[PDB]
């Protein structure tokens, strides 16, 4: 997250770190959202590679174990069947991960609330992006979970020629793009949490930024619009 600050410890308790095994250790690769005790929502591109993945719930500092974490293997990966690795702008950048065990819900580990099917937020709606991603374009991963206010940019503006043009689809949410605050590498798969009727719901799954950098004016961070996928999500969970 570019332009953000350290999040209050465990204050986004559905935020997960998706990690792959790397030599004698594990490496953070992406964010995700816990949506059931044994299901995580992330980006499809995060699981392109056929690696050994785990999810960490209750995480805050990637480099110290603080007693709130639970570490659980990814057992089954269900990518949206229309996702194409070679065509990110087509959309469908979403995957569900069934965990090898159910996590224990507690004050540090909670389910993320999803929007109602079809929900579109008004332009400039209040949202926060969270993640352990780079804190500057070509910078360093965050040791501690970061957050930044990233208000929505509606479809009509985001898909205009001066922003993303036809690259952005109505199955996506855009947020930010003032050239100041943004997601960045290591944040993808994670949530965009948007305030609706006093409750945060996860409206976005972080997908892509400009190839010029993370915080780029008129290139807001682009997310998979979770409310476009509610039926898909429910179908996957019910059949697995």
């Amino acid at each position: 997250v570019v332009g953000g600050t350290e999040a209050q410890r465990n204050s986004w308790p559905s935020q997960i770190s998706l990690q792959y095994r790397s030599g004698s250790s594990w490496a953070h690769t992406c964010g995700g959202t816990l949506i059931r005790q044994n299901w995580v929502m992330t980006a499809a591109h995060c699981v392109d590679r056929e690696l050994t993945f785990r999810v960490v719930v209750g995480e805050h500092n990637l480099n110290q174990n603080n007693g709130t974490e639970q570490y659980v293997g990814v057992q089954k990966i269900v990518v949206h069947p229309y996702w194409n690795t070679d065509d990110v702008a087509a959309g469908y950048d979403i995957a569900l991960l069934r965990l090898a065990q159910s996590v224990t819900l507690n004050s540090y580990v909670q389910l993320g609330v999803l929007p109602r099917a079809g929900t579109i937020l008004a332009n400039n709606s209040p949202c926060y992006i969270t993640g352990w991603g780079l804190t500057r374009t070509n910078g360093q991963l965050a040791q501690t979970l970061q957050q930044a206010y990233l208000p929505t940019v509606d479809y009509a503006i985001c898909s205009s020629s001066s922003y993303w043009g036809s690259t952005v689809k109505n199955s996506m949410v855009c947020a930010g793009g003032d050239g100041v605050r943004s997601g960045c590498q290591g944040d993808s798969g994670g949530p965009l949490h948007c305030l609706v009727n006093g409750q945060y719901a996860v409206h976005g799954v972080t997908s892509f930024v400009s190839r010029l950098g993370c915080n780029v004016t008129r290139k807001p961070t682009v997310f998979t619009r979770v409310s476009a996928y509610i039926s898909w999500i429910n179908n996957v969970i019910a059949s697995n």
Binding site: T29, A43, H45, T85, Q185, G186, V209
Partner: peptide, 8 residues
């Protein structure tokens, strides 16, 4: 664009 990961 560029996906958010390393480096997709």
């Amino acid at each position: 664009x560029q996906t958010t990961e390393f480096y997709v």
